[PDB]
Design a binder for these strands. Sequence first.
DNA 1: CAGAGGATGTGGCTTC
DNA 2: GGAAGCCACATCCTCT
Lengths: 104, 128
Amino acid sequence: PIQLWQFLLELLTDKSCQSFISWTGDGWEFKLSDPDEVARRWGKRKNKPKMNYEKLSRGLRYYYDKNIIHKTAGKRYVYRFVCDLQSLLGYTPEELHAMLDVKP
Amino acid sequence: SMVEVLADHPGELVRTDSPNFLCSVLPTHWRCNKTLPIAFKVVALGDVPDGTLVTVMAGNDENYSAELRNATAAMKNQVARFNDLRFVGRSGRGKSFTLTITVFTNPPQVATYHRAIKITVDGPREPR
DNA sequence: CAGAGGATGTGGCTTC
DNA sequence: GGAAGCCACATCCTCT
């Protein structure tokens, strides 16, 4: 059993995926630069060949209430974890950025 | 009066613990936050002037006071037609909510519909 | 198009 | 073990 936000967190902590999903450099804010690739990989991980960005984002919208992820208004494909990731990862955003050579 | 009204529009009305009011039959088990198949209505046998407000509360041993939606209606020609009433709160495994209907006359009146409806996250569902 | 949210239907899991 | 609950989407869809 894997959840959308956990999956996005995996992609965001693997430097190989930085071409399609990456942190913005601002806190826990991230961007799906290539929404289709994330969707495809999300579809593959759940075994849902038809998965696309329109349905993956519906998944993200349900998180608005659960205070897990919020949208960054005005910036296409940009969201931000609002839960306590530091607590869960044991790293501040600045430390995690550095481990991944995140370019703001 | 009550006998004629129940026969007026047969099968769809049920008795409250109050002799001056009757209400729509509710499904035995329904999905929380889902629209009811039949619009819930409260009928007044005695005289209730139009405009009188009517509300419903739901609750039982697990949930003293359940979250509802559109739980307020206005009497018109002795009928309070709730526009899309909904049950958001859950009533607990194997349990049903008890409805308390309050008709805002002066003085207020209260009619009760015991063990009226079970509300769960899935609602009536096909066997797996 | 992107994005908010409502309405429904499913598979995975946990509780009795 | 199974029925009945809870969850997290997957799918569509209306609207801004």
